[PDB]
Amino acid sequence: MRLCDRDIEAWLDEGRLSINPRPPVERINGATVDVRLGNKFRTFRGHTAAFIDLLDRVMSDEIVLDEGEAFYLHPGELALAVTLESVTLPADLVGWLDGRSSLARLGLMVHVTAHRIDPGWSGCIVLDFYNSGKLPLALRPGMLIGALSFEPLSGPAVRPY
Amino acid sequence: MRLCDRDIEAWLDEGRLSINPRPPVERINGATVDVRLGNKFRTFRGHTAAFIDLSGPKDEVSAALDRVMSDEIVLDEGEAFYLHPGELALAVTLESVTLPADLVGWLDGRSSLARLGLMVHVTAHRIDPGWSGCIVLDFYNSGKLPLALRPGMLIGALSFEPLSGPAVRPYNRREDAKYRNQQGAVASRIDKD
Amino acid sequence: MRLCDRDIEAWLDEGRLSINPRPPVERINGATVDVRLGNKFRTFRGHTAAFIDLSGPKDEVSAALDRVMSDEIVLDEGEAFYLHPGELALAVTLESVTLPADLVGWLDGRSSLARLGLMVHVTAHRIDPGWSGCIVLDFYNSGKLPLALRPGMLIGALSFEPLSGPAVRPYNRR
Amino acid sequence: MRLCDRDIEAWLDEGRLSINPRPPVERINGATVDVRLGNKFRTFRGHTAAFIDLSGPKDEVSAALDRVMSDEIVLDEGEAFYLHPGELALAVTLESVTLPADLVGWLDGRSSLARLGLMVHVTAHRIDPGWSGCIVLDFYNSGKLPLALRPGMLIGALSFEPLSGPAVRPYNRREDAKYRNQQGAVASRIDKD
Amino acid sequence: MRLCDRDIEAWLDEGRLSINPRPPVERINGATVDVRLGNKFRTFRGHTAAFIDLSGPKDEVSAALDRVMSDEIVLDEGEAFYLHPGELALAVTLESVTLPADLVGWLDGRSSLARLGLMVHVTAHRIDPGWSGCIVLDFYNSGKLPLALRPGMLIGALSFEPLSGPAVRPYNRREDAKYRNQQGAVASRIDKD
Amino acid sequence: MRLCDRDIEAWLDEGRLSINPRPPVERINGATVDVRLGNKFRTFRGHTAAFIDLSGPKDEVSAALDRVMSDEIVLDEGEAFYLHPGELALAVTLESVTLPADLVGWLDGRSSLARLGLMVHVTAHRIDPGWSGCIVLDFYNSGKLPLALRPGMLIGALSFEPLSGPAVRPYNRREDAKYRNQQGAVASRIDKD
Ligand SMILES: O=c1ccn([C@H]2C[C@H](O)[C@@H](COP(=O)(O)OP(=O)(O)OP(=O)(O)O)O2)c(=O)[nH]1
Ligand SMILES: O=c1ccn([C@H]2C[C@H](O)[C@@H](COP(=O)(O)OP(=O)(O)OP(=O)(O)O)O2)c(=O)[nH]1
Ligand SMILES: O=c1ccn([C@H]2C[C@H](O)[C@@H](COP(=O)(O)OP(=O)(O)OP(=O)(O)O)O2)c(=O)[nH]1
Ligand SMILES: O=c1ccn([C@H]2C[C@H](O)[C@@H](COP(=O)(O)OP(=O)(O)OP(=O)(O)O)O2)c(=O)[nH]1
Ligand SMILES: O=c1ccn([C@H]2C[C@H](O)[C@@H](COP(=O)(O)OP(=O)(O)OP(=O)(O)O)O2)c(=O)[nH]1
Ligand SMILES: O=c1ccn([C@H]2C[C@H](O)[C@@H](COP(=O)(O)OP(=O)(O)OP(=O)(O)O)O2)c(=O)[nH]1
Ligand SMILES: [Mg+2]
Ligand SMILES: [Mg+2]
Ligand SMILES: [Mg+2]
Numbered sequence A: 001m002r003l004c005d006r007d008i009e010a011w012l013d014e015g016r017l018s019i020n021p022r023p024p025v026e027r028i029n030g031a032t033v034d035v036r037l038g039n040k041f042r043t044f045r046g047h048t049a050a051f052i053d054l055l056d057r058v059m060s061d062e063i064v065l066d067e068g069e070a071f072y073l074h075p076g077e078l079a080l081a082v083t084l085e086s087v088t089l090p091a092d093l094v095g096w097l098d099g100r101s102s103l104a105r106l107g108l109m110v111h112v113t114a115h116r117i118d119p120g121w122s123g124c125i126v127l128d129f130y131n132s133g134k135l136p137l138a139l140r141p142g143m144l145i146g147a148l149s150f151e152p153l154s155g156p157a158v159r160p161y
Numbered sequence B, D, E, F: 001m002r003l004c005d006r007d008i009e010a011w012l013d014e015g016r017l018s019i020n021p022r023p024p025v026e027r028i029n030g031a032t033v034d035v036r037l038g039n040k041f042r043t044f045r046g047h048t049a050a051f052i053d054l055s056g057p058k059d060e061v062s063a064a065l066d067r068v069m070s071d072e073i074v075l076d077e078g079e080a081f082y083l084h085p086g087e088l089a090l091a092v093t094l095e096s097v098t099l100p101a102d103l104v105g106w107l108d109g110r111s112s113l114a115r116l117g118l119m120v121h122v123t124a125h126r127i128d129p130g131w132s133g134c135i136v137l138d139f140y141n142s143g144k145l146p147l148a149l150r151p152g153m154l155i156g157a158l159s160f161e162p163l164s165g166p167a168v169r170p171y172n173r174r175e176d177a178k179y180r181n182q183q184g185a186v187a188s189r190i191d192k193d
Numbered sequence C: 001m002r003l004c005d006r007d008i009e010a011w012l013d014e015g016r017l018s019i020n021p022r023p024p025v026e027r028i029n030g031a032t033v034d035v036r037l038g039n040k041f042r043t044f045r046g047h048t049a050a051f052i053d054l055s056g057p058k059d060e061v062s063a064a065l066d067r068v069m070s071d072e073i074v075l076d077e078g079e080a081f082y083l084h085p086g087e088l089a090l091a092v093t094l095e096s097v098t099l100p101a102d103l104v105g106w107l108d109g110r111s112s113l114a115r116l117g118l119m120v121h122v123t124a125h126r127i128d129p130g131w132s133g134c135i136v137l138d139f140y141n142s143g144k145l146p147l148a149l150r151p152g153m154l155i156g157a158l159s160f161e162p163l164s165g166p167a168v169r170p171y172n173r174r
């Protein structure tokens, strides 16, 4: 059971849920809220290590782009990024990050199987971008990148985030 | 709450939800309806552009997209589409799906295909309330072998979830919705953003 | 409606939902249970075939998959499985899961691992009502570094959704 | 012994060796002649076949090759071919080269291109005694960035080695030679083996 | 100076150079002898190790090599080895070659195979004076399609270059030479450095 | 004709050819001198640019190259550079080489490294008459495993070939030569074309 657009907006009014900045009415529709891309990226530098045992001589310094700059996501490359919006969920809501079909049709994955936003989460969401396509994708802060949907839990989470 | 098999049948009978052609009972079980592969495909031509500027000027984006997308591939009967490792291709479900304003659908792949590397979507798997049409698939082969895909094969599964109420802005009424009544392997319309 | 953590423990206590071995409460938070990695693996050997025809049942499974798979790789502890970028490997969860006819399950990854490119499924992530057993994992490394994986590590997260009613053709019947 | 720049000029003056159009003095130095990129290309269409059986039955091989090779791509002036990382493409030199029976030629790339990942051949770089024609290039981009290739750019270098004597079976006289008088981006003729 | 066809035959007749089995006149032309593919192969098993420390402690390097190399694959008659894009595999020439102290040899691929992406070596293509044995090939498919390789196919070419004099330390006399009298698809012996 | 080990030693004694530091006798055999890996490296930063326009406007090319090339990496003693499959990196030989106007040099890899997928060049492997300096290596790992590279390891081999006479336009006298007296892991200077 997902919250329809009208109940998403009612939870935003009520302060049960908060998304800041708040997307316009045009970006809240069906069972989803459209979310945009922020301005902090990282990439991986493999020459420093042979492997990781499942930490961070391998990550770049945070990359913040100048106005009018794009991050170029090349095919076969994983990059970390953030949502522009901060999201705060109550103890009885779980959220689910999904991509956009327009971007999937060019090969952009906006996550890599972890896509659950936990009850009690508060913060911008970290994105793991992967370009499975043939062409480099120029990514710019502020672009629509995904969508979030919200599922109420059976009851309130005892151990929320 | 997802609809169990029995309730999917009841929504289909009531005409709330439609899937055309309607799958037989054998294809509806648990909490999912199996869907089949259509016969329209599209590939990418990288040599004609350096990149795609996703949120660039509409006319530039549009011209880049038209350069990189192949024409639609239609397979005869007996023909396979060979999906090579590392290649992304667009395909389409045989079935058209129509959802009412108070239901959302979700596309998943099949474990039998996944174990060979076949991804049937690339993180966009939601079918919106008010959707009507064939579903475009973005296949990616993450395995070690080419996979021969044939029209009519079972390619994924759809599940359905009731919304908390009817959507106020369902897909069929949204003025800026890009993919209303989509029929073949439709390329990205990111230029309409 | 996902089951929340307290409601996950209830269902386990009832005994229709079961995970064997039973995870400690430390592993059950919010609306998910963390699951662990088993010690059975499979890789592919490309050199014995040109392709696989996915239009099928069972003729592939066998005459295909069986012929392009490794024998089963069982690791002694102290040993790692090295998952190299761009390689797909088959693994299995440590725990066996049994679902009743009125519940569907869903395997997700862990954000901590996904940030390094670990994909724990490849679009098929639904555990059906009536399902009984260890879950097969299809791992894929989308990152830039090999990842060492060790039997027993926390590898993913399961969440659970009640069905609208009990399924009529559940996995054990079908 | 390779011919030094002075001797390459003497062989060209004597008409022993020909390169058409003849490069200017600025392109002939040390032990090499710099060559330029032509404007014909070819790519591969993988989705039409599972594999190529190199020493299989001639008619099956031939049909597979005709399926997988694109039509010839001809670039206008102003146009680039975009060579993406991991992609193999065929191209052709601007120059036609004719060798006598007592000389062998060798194609190399340029360090400036190599340091970006551009390979101009794939382990076949010998130009046989008796050869006459344009040279087909198999480009592979082993780097991290797409490379815009434009007709007319400097793409590699040829050097030349006298043989111990004139070849008895030079290329122009061999009945089973596959590539005599080649002109565009000619695809593999492995089916003629 | 490379030996022309006629002089290759003269060196073979004189027993200065040997190639066993001796290729027929049809395979010796211009400045080269065509060589054929043997029936022994080796692949790599990545899952057993994180990396190879090339100049590490000998025992650690040796243990890593033994873990990553497959057992020798021997093809029956009729059987193909399928070389998929992006895969490196070891193979061997059908012919054994023996060089005297005053000759060096050079392995090239074939343009017909190169045009499909097949590299027959990975920047090591010298056959040393005093060499005796079958030649190990490191195949890499840089193309878009799997290639079916069959024993006995023509895979490459050898040319031969006189040295300025006889080598004082030819391969057959060097104590630390690793690959003397190699016969199957011998894996790297970098651990002997 | 390549110089045999004995003549390489004579050319070095005569000061015709220089290699600094001079390799010991154990590293000079057959027709080659073994060379060793230096301790400077450079990688690529793809996220800063969409592509490189090889024969575009000089200032655009120059700005793109400055964006995509890393700063020089210098490894301490004990440190390895990890070269992952599919990655291209720039490195340098430990040795500086100086060639006279009548000699050309040729860089090859090692069979031991090739059997693990290490390419030490990307089709540009000529050292010109009049060259003086350390040689930049473009490493590519075509194998399945990361390779740990350490400064000082044996990485390849140089051979030498007399020219038909002294070059009139050797590298040290060419005004437009791009890489005279190169010392570290120098990036492509394709912008100087
Ligand atoms: O794999 C998919 C996923 C979705 N759809 C359809 C159903 C869905 O209702 C519609 C829009 O999906 P989404 O909102 O992801 O796409 P968008 O790129 O945001 O398009 P829009 O601008 O119309 O929302 O596309 C497909 O054809 N294939
Ligand atoms: O794409 C994602 C996915 C998740 N998260 C956040 C929201 C979620 O509530 C939290 C934890 O996710 P998960 O439980 O998957 O991470 P973990 O690896 O288990 O770490 P933890 O120990 O924090 O539970 O990470 C993101 O920011 N981006
Ligand atoms: O990553 C997964 C996903 C699913 N399953 C199990 C649970 C699920 O209930 C069953 C069947 O899944 P699915 O319907 O995706 O498989 P299929 O390929 O359609 O096979 P079947 O014909 O058995 O339904 O497989 C796994 O072991 N691993
Ligand atoms: O792997 C190599 C190959 C060459 N060189 C040096 C020696 C050679 O003499 C010089 C120039 O080589 P080339 O002519 O192939 O490079 P270019 O791009 O043509 O530059 P230029 O215009 O200076 O000739 O660079 C290297 O350092 N590394
Ligand atoms: O990069 C190259 C290499 C060679 N050739 C031409 C010149 C050479 O003289 C001829 C044949 O080369 P090769 O003998 O390597 O080709 P093959 O596949 O063996 O063909 P054939 O049966 O004609 O010898 O092809 C090219 O056009 N491009
Ligand atoms: O593709 C090849 C190239 C060479 N060789 C043989 C012939 C050559 O004379 C010998 C040694 O080659 P190289 O010197 O390149 O190998 P190494 O790694 O340096 O070994 P060594 O320490 O024996 O010199 O290996 C092959 O079998 N296959
Ligand atoms: Mg949308
Ligand atoms: Mg199923
Ligand atoms: Mg967690």
Ligand SMILES: [Mg+2]
Pocket: D110
């Ligand atoms: Mg040059």
Ligand SMILES: [Mg+2]
Pocket: E110
């Ligand atoms: Mg030939």
Ligand SMILES: [Mg+2]
Pocket: F110
């Ligand atoms: Mg050696």
